[PDB]
Amino acid sequence: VQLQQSGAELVRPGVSVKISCKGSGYIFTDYVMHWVIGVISTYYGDGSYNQKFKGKATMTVDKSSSTAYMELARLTSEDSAIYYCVRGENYYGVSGTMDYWGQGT
Amino acid sequence: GVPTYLLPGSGQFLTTDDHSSAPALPCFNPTPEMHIPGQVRNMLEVVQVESMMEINNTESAVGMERLKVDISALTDVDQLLFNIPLDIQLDGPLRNTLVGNISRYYTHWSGSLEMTFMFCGSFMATGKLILCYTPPGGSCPTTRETAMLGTHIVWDFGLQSSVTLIIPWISGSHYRSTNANVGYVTCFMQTNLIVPSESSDTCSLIGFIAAKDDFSLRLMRDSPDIG
Amino acid sequence: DIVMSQSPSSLAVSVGEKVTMSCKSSQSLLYSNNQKNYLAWYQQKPGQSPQLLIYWASTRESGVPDRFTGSESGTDFTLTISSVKAEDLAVFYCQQYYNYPWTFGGGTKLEIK
Amino acid sequence: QVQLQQSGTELAKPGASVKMSCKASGYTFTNYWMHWFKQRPGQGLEWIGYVNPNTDYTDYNHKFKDKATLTADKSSSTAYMQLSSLTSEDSAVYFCARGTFGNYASFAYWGQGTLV
Amino acid sequence: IQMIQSPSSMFVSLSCRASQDIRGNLDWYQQKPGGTIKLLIYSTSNLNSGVPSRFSGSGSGSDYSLTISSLESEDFADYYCLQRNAYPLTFGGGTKL
Amino acid sequence: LQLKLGNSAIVTQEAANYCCAYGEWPNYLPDHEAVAIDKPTQPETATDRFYTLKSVKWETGSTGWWWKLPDALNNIGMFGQNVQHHYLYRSGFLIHVQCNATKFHQGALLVVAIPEHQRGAHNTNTSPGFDDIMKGEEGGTFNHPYVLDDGTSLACATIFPHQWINLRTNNSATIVLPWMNAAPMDFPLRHNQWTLAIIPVVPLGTRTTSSMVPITVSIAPMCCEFNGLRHAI
Amino acid sequence: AIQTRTVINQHGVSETLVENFLSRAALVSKRSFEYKDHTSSAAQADKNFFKWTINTRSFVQLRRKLELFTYLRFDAEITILTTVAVNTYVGLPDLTLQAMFVPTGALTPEKQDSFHWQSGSNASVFFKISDPPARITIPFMCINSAYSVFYDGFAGFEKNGLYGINPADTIGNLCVRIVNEHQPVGFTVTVRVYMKPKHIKAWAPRPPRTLPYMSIANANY
């Protein structure tokens, strides 16, 4: 029920970074990692990205380490916001609600 | 209860079976029948209607100029105007008729036919033609002298304007190649055309065809006309 | 895309009242099997992450006191606070999650006087 | 197969006469008129006359009324045309054509020519 | 009667007039340089039995014309016109094509 | 040698023929107690007249004509006034086509009557509108007569009721048309059952230029009845 | 090309009847709905059904054969055949479908699950995949006395109307969905529908069409 991630980082434009969300307190491969609307579904999943963030965001998952990585290439100065992870909920295949939130990065 | 056992072939689905079905809407009364005129009950009522053929079997005849052959005053006294190969399945004058579109759906056909010509010149114009029928054995004649010794009629279109020729018997199938030489109806010139100085010098013919009342069809298949 | 606009635009009330706030949606948000309108209600206190209050527009989250119960129909939505207290200063959020991509509400900031 | 076979070429001194022939074979003679033509080299053709081999009745162009004579032969199937009083202006090629069964003067079949 | 050939040479809507009206009654002949002549059009609109389709003729009261759509290698031969309205028969001039 | 129907008279017939479209005569409807029973009018005495249309002109380059029979009579007379403010009709027709040439003309026409002739526009995807179908009293013209403007054949178009006008033999044709529709009564301002169409198969000719050779069409509603407009209370 | 001949002898005229001419269960509609994503929206999951109007001028093998007549009168006899597909387990599931028939004047459903699928006033059929295929006959539901194949008129009383569309001709579409609601993520269910027109009556024959078609609404060549 706790979503710990990286603390804080900020680089100069022209450098790609990576954000990792560590999920602990609940069982894995049963929920859909949102990003506040790209998902990864945590079970050999590709997930559907947003249309505006389609080339900007590229992400994967690691089932053993229980982490949800996310790469952002070609950063600009417009990226002064808070990018983090949400646990989601996936019952039958539908995408469900937005239960527990991340820390903040 | 009654003791049963299942046969082999139990639960299959033929496309050509005749069994009852579960009604969608019981207690629904459709609209009652009305006497609409012109009911057809059998597709041999369609092939027995006359329908014109394409006598003009030359190449690069485009449009509705295929339905007629022109004879003129400057023509020779011994030459042929046309011949109809009596092949329904093949390309030619009898492909796009009314007897040659219904008998594409069926495989085997056998029966007697009925041809009718009609002269469309002016009231003054005269002359004679000759209409030769060749059985499936012999070949098509090339001169008028060798064509007279068959079955012929000498048609004077100065008095009459329509003639009737009875084809005795044709038959055919598809034979998985194709049969040929089921007959020929060829037409030679006898005398030259005689027109006065006021009518035009070009006249024309129109040919018709219709099956008789002993034509028959069997083993329905799918037509290649649209596929 | 479904836009989620909010009408009251950051109201400012006093302690002890009973407040509501509107949330508009461009089209219907009813899921067929559920026959339940997909809607989420949030609360972010300043300095920390938001927190889920009400899901399905009428169902209270386990761990939420009974002063948070709000429900509406149509394409207009609200959340009702039974007793306004001095610790409820937040920017309340309404979210649709019926159709990709998921858009948030306009944000309604509460000012406590 | 219809063939119109003419004779070879020849020449004559001015003041003499000469005779040609257009032997026809492949069709029925004495049904079709036999016309005759003249082509001075470098110019167009010109009509001379005809002969009716059924009734032996001829008809000439007015310009060639006194030059040419036109006969016919049923036994050998040959049409002749004899000139008279040759000059230097009577040097051309000479054609023969077949008419029509209805006497309409259409010229589907021709000869090859005879240079004088 | 006199007939004129309106073009003298062409390097394809060749035409010919007449002194009087001839009521159709006009043929079109072509002469190969070998020395062979065969007709193409008779009675100003029809076609001979054994000619390719490109050739076509037009008619009027007194001013007639031959029309070819597309050319050809051995199409290059001079074309004559003949009236048969009244004796004597008069040809044209010819267009060396 | 003539025929007379009420007010109008036609003295022009050579001989009498009565093509029946499918073997039947136009007749009134039986057992109409369930189809808009409002005492239908039966104006049989006041509508049966030969409405002779205008004369069309047949030359060598002509290519065909077509009329639509509930449409060509909507603005003419006692039928044209009854076809407004009566909202339903049921009728059958009688057509008399008669050209007139001398003993020196030559040619042939095909006078055919086509039920439910749905037309079609050449080489596009737009179905034709209200002004390409509803012409009225002036007819139309076949653009491509060899396919009857709908992709079918003209060689097989003798399956409809038809007669021939061969100018060597005759110059007249007569077709009697019954009520050919699924519903018992029909709306006259938007649906057209039959379609008269005359097509010159063999074009005409003479030594001189092509003559006018005019063609004259006469239409007569045989057994017509509309709804009831006057009631007791 | 070998040219062969054989003497043909035959009797009887019973293979050219109109009842025997227009039959034999041609396929009319084949469309499959499949699944490829591990997660989907709650709006894509309400679009897992299909519908098709039973105007049978769809395949030109049977459209050309049907346009030899002007008026027809028959009934349908639908037959629905269902098979299953893949893309570590390879065995195929056994799952239940529903095929509701919506006549004219009733509302068609706009979502996979809606109060229309539960309404009693339309004939729904529930069939599995491990059974013999479903079969329903559908009666003559025109309000004239015959189906107008060719219609020479306009639909409504206005200028901008569609030409050649009879408003009293349509029968009413049928709608098919899977009732199991659990999104099979790696499979593909394919539905084939057949029609056998029986109890045929036909009126007013027409000449057959030679030039190929250009649309499914008219005859433009």
Side-chain angles (χ1 to χ4, degrees):
Chain A
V1 301
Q2 292 178 356
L3 295 175
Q4 187 65 41
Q5 63 181 1
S6 67
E9 69 269 14
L10 194 148
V11 298
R12 292 181 181 178
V15 178
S16 67
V17 298
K18 185 183 286 185
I19 301 168
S20 178
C21 173
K22 178 67 182 295
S24 179
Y26 61 94
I27 57 175
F28 200 70
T29 69
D30 282 327
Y31 293 98
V32 286
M33 293 294 176
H34 295 284
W35 290 96
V36 175
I37 196 63
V39 299
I40 203 65
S41 70
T42 67
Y43 182 72
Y44 293 104
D46 188 75
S48 65
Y49 294 99
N50 196 358
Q51 185 63 41
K52 295 184 287 294
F53 295 96
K54 184 174 175 65
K56 185 70 181 294
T58 297
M59 61 187 177
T60 182
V61 73
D62 193 2
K63 293 185 263 75
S64 296
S65 179
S66 296
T67 58
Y69 297 103
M70 182 179 179
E71 294 181 355
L72 281 78
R74 294 178 180 177
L75 295 176
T76 61
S77 295
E78 295 177 354
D79 299 332
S80 66
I82 297 96
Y83 291 161
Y84 64 98
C85 58
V86 192
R87 69 177 292 166
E89 197 169 7
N90 190 1
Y91 286 109
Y92 293 96
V94 298
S95 294
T97 182
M98 196 73 83
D99 286 330
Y100 292 157
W101 292 87
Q103 185 180 4
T105 297
Chain B
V2 285
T4 63
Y5 64 95
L6 300 177
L7 277 77
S10 175
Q12 66 185 357
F13 170 64
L14 277 82
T15 66
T16 63
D17 56 353
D18 192 3
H19 294 290
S20 67
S21 301
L25 299 173
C27 297
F28 175 75
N29 296 115
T31 59
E33 296 181 355
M34 195 186 80
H35 183 271
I36 298 169
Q39 186 177 3
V40 59
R41 294 179 180 89
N42 196 356
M43 297 301 290
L44 273 49
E45 299 178 356
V46 180
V47 301
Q48 295 174 359
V49 178
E50 61 183 1
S51 66
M52 68 188 75
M53 69 181 78
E54 294 178 352
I55 299 294
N56 198 0
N57 52 6
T58 189
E59 292 88 6
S60 179
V62 178
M64 65 188 297
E65 294 177 352
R66 299 182 64 87
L67 303 176
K68 57 187 285 291
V69 283
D70 289 330
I71 59 172
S72 63
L74 286 59
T75 191
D76 201 0
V77 72
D78 288 330
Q79 69 179 359
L80 58 91
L81 300 177
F82 55 90
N83 53 353
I84 292 100
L86 294 177
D87 289 327
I88 293 171
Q89 59 180 355
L90 293 177
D91 193 1
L94 301 183
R95 179 178 67 85
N96 195 1
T97 57
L98 198 36
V99 72
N101 283 317
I102 307 299
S103 68
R104 293 290 173 86
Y105 294 100
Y106 294 97
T107 300
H108 304 97
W109 61 88
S110 71
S112 64
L113 268 61
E114 189 268 335
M115 292 179 67
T116 299
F117 294 98
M118 187 178 74
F119 183 74
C120 295
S122 63
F123 185 73
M124 292 289 106
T126 57
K128 289 187 287 293
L129 292 173
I130 176 168
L131 292 168
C132 300
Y133 172 70
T134 301
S139 181
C140 57
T142 59
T143 60
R144 187 190 60 82
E145 180 68 28
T146 62
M148 182 183 72
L149 277 314
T151 300
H152 69 279
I153 57 174
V154 179
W155 175 41
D156 189 1
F157 53 89
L159 282 316
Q160 289 184 356
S161 299
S162 295
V163 81
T164 299
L165 186 67
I166 301 296
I167 305 301
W169 187 266
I170 66 166
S171 66
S173 178
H174 286 85
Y175 297 109
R176 288 184 64 196
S177 296
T178 59
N179 51 1
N181 297 111
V182 189
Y184 292 96
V185 178
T186 179
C187 177
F188 292 91
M189 190 70 75
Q190 176 62 255
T191 63
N192 198 359
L193 187 68
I194 295 170
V195 293
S197 297
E198 185 67 29
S199 295
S200 180
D201 55 352
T202 300
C203 296
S204 295
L205 292 171
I206 296 171
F208 294 147
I209 196 164
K212 295 293 287 184
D213 53 354
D214 54 354
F215 195 77
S216 180
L217 294 167
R218 196 175 68 188
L219 190 63
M220 182 177 71
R221 65 182 178 91
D222 49 352
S223 175
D225 198 6
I226 211 67
Chain C
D1 293 332
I2 298 171
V3 63
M4 298 300 289
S5 65
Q6 293 180 356
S7 178
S9 297
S10 178
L11 294 174
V13 297
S14 296
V15 178
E17 295 181 355
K18 185 175 181 180
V19 296
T20 62
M21 53 187 67
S22 177
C23 181
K24 292 180 181 180
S25 64
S26 66
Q27 61 187 357
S28 179
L29 295 173
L30 190 144
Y31 185 67
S32 317
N33 304 288
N34 287 326
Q35 312 269 18
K36 291 179 175 66
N37 291 314
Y38 278 177
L39 186 70
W41 289 104
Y42 295 153
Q43 178 177 2
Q44 56 174 358
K45 294 180 181 180
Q48 63 185 358
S49 66
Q51 192 269 330
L52 180 65
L53 293 175
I54 305 298
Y55 64 96
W56 291 349
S58 179
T59 300
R60 187 176 64 245
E61 181 66 29
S62 178
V64 174
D66 294 332
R67 69 182 63 89
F68 289 158
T69 300
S71 297
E72 280 180 354
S73 297
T75 61
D76 294 333
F77 290 143
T78 199
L79 176 61
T80 305
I81 298 173
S82 178
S83 178
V84 178
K85 291 184 180 180
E87 293 86 3
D88 292 333
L89 56 93
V91 179
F92 285 166
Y93 285 158
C94 56
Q95 188 187 4
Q96 62 91 31
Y97 54 95
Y98 180 79
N99 194 1
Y100 286 164
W102 293 352
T103 62
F104 292 95
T108 302
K109 186 184 287 185
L110 187 64
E111 295 177 355
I112 294 170
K113 65 183 180 180
Chain D
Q1 184 67 40
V2 175
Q3 293 181 357
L4 278 299
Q5 185 68 40
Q6 295 183 0
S7 67
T9 181
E10 71 267 13
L11 75 157
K13 299 284 102 175
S17 66
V18 70
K19 182 181 282 189
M20 296 169 289
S21 68
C22 175
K23 184 178 185 295
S25 66
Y27 63 92
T28 302
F29 196 71
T30 69
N31 281 324
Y32 300 141
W33 292 355
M34 189 68 72
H35 294 274
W36 287 88
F37 294 95
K38 175 174 182 181
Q39 184 181 5
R40 179 70 173 85
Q43 295 177 357
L45 281 80
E46 188 174 2
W47 184 68
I48 294 172
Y50 64 91
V51 58
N52 192 2
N54 195 3
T55 59
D56 291 330
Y57 179 75
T58 63
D59 192 3
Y60 296 150
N61 194 359
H62 186 272
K63 186 176 180 180
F64 297 98
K65 182 63 66 68
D66 293 330
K67 295 291 181 69
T69 60
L70 275 172
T71 59
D73 194 4
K74 292 183 181 179
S75 297
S76 64
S77 297
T78 306
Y80 298 101
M81 184 259 274
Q82 180 179 2
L83 294 174
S84 178
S85 69
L86 293 174
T87 60
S88 178
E89 292 87 4
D90 291 333
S91 66
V93 293
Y94 286 144
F95 289 151
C96 58
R98 186 182 67 85
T100 319
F101 189 78
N103 305 126
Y104 284 100
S106 178
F107 288 145
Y109 292 151
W110 287 83
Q112 72 269 13
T114 299
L115 194 146
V116 174
Chain E
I1 191 166
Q2 291 88 17
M3 292 184 66
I4 61 100
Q5 188 66 256
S6 178
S8 295
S9 295
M10 188 66 205
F11 288 153
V12 293
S13 179
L14 68 158
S15 68
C16 62
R17 293 183 290 170
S19 177
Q20 301 177 1
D21 50 350
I22 51 177
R23 294 180 179 91
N25 289 321
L26 186 136
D27 300 335
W28 290 96
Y29 297 92
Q30 69 95 32
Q31 185 177 4
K32 299 299 292 295
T36 62
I37 302 171
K38 63 183 291 295
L39 83 160
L40 302 174
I41 306 301
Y42 63 94
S43 295
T44 204
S45 176
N46 295 318
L47 277 76
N48 196 7
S49 180
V51 63
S53 57
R54 40 179 174 275
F55 299 103
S56 65
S58 178
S60 72
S62 180
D63 298 333
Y64 299 162
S65 65
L66 183 65
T67 301
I68 307 168
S69 67
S70 65
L71 277 308
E72 195 267 332
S73 67
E74 64 184 2
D75 191 79
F76 293 158
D78 49 354
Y79 292 163
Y80 293 98
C81 61
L82 176 63
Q83 64 91 26
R84 62 182 191 267
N85 194 4
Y87 290 101
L89 303 179
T90 61
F91 286 91
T95 69
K96 183 63 65 67
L97 190 275
Chain F
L1 281 174
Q2 66 181 356
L3 71 160
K4 179 174 70 67
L5 184 61
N7 194 3
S8 67
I10 299 298
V11 303
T12 78
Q13 66 171 357
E14 176 67 28
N17 250 312
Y18 296 138
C19 191
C20 288
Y22 283 110
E24 286 84 3
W25 292 95
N27 199 1
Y28 295 103
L29 81 166
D31 65 6
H32 62 85
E33 75 268 14
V35 186
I37 176 171
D38 200 358
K39 189 178 179 180
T41 301
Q42 189 181 1
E44 196 271 331
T45 61
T47 313
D48 47 355
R49 236 199 316 117
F50 285 102
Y51 299 111
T52 64
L53 298 175
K54 291 176 95 288
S55 295
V56 298
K57 186 178 180 183
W58 174 32
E59 292 178 352
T60 300
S62 292
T63 182
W65 298 274
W66 59 267
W67 292 268
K68 291 186 183 291
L69 288 173
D71 196 7
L73 296 174
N74 280 322
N75 198 1
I76 299 299
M78 293 76 166
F79 187 80
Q81 290 177 356
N82 281 320
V83 84
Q84 288 93 20
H85 64 270
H86 277 280
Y87 174 70
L88 291 176
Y89 84 112
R90 183 186 191 274
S91 67
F93 297 97
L94 184 143
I95 301 171
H96 186 76
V97 179
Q98 180 168 0
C99 64
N100 46 1
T102 60
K103 281 92 171 64
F104 296 107
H105 291 94
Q106 57 101 30
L109 291 174
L110 177 62
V111 181
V112 70
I114 304 167
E116 296 290 335
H117 181 68
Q118 183 179 1
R119 292 185 60 85
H122 173 71
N123 198 0
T124 186
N125 291 317
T126 300
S127 65
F130 189 81
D131 290 331
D132 294 334
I133 306 300
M134 301 296 285
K135 302 294 286 184
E137 199 266 331
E138 294 177 353
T141 297
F142 286 105
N143 290 316
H144 302 285
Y146 183 71
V147 296
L148 286 174
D149 292 336
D150 55 354
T152 60
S153 295
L154 185 143
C156 302
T158 64
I159 192 67
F160 300 120
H162 71 285
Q163 288 189 359
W164 288 92
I165 297 173
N166 191 3
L167 283 175
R168 183 174 179 175
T169 299
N170 55 357
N171 56 358
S172 179
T174 303
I175 307 100
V176 176
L177 298 175
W179 175 249
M180 189 72 204
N181 197 2
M185 295 180 75
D186 198 5
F187 297 94
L189 290 174
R190 69 186 184 182
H191 188 197
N192 303 319
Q193 293 91 22
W194 293 96
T195 299
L196 183 66
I198 56 175
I199 296 165
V201 175
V202 173
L204 59 85
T206 182
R207 294 288 185 183
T208 182
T209 189
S210 297
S211 178
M212 48 177 285
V213 193
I215 304 168
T216 300
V217 186
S218 299
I219 305 164
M222 181 55 71
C223 291
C224 60
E225 55 187 356
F226 297 91
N227 64 2
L229 203 44
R230 293 184 290 115
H231 191 73
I233 59 173
Chain G
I2 297 98
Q3 296 181 357
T4 64
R5 291 172 184 170
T6 307
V7 178
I8 295 172
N9 49 353
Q10 62 189 358
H11 296 286
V13 182
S14 68
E15 303 193 3
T16 62
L17 294 174
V18 183
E19 178 69 28
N20 291 319
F21 187 78
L22 294 168
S23 289
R24 292 189 179 184
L27 189 146
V28 289
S29 177
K30 184 258 285 183
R31 55 181 295 168
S32 67
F33 51 95
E34 65 186 2
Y35 304 99
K36 292 181 183 294
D37 295 330
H38 288 89
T39 179
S40 69
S41 177
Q44 187 179 2
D46 286 335
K47 294 177 177 66
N48 287 320
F49 67 100
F50 66 94
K51 65 180 74 173
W52 68 284
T53 313
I54 314 177
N55 290 321
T56 180
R57 57 182 188 273
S58 65
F59 286 169
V60 301
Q61 298 293 322
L62 184 276
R63 182 180 175 182
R64 183 186 181 275
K65 189 176 181 182
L66 206 49
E67 287 180 350
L68 273 72
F69 302 100
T70 303
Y71 298 106
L72 293 169
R73 182 181 173 93
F74 60 94
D75 52 359
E77 194 171 1
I78 307 296
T79 298
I80 303 166
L81 184 66
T82 300
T83 61
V84 175
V86 176
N87 197 3
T88 184
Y89 181 68
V90 77
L92 287 321
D94 191 6
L95 54 89
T96 305
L97 280 79
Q98 181 183 4
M100 181 177 69
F101 174 69
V102 180
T104 61
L107 277 76
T108 57
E110 58 192 353
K111 288 178 175 175
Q112 180 202 6
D113 195 340
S114 86
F115 64 96
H116 299 93
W117 296 96
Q118 302 173 359
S119 178
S121 298
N122 48 3
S124 297
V125 65
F126 289 94
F127 60 95
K128 292 185 183 294
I129 295 173
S130 67
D131 286 334
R135 183 185 291 270
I136 294 172
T137 181
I138 294 174
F140 177 75
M141 290 189 292
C142 178
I143 67 173
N144 293 320
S145 298
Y147 294 115
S148 294
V149 175
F150 291 95
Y151 183 75
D152 191 3
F154 293 95
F157 188 72
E158 68 181 2
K159 298 293 292 296
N160 193 2
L162 290 173
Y163 176 71
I165 292 174
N166 194 2
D169 198 8
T170 184
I171 303 170
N173 45 0
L174 64 88
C175 303
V176 178
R177 72 183 178 96
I178 290 176
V179 79
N180 284 103
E181 76 187 7
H182 74 278
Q183 297 291 113
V185 296
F187 291 152
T188 297
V189 180
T190 305
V191 175
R192 292 179 175 88
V193 181
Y194 293 92
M195 288 183 67
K196 184 186 289 182
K198 63 181 185 294
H199 295 284
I200 308 292
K201 290 184 184 294
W203 291 271
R206 297 181 68 88
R209 181 163 183 171
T210 60
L211 272 73
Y213 291 98
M214 199 171 178
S215 296
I216 62 169
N218 50 4
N220 284 320
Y221 57 100

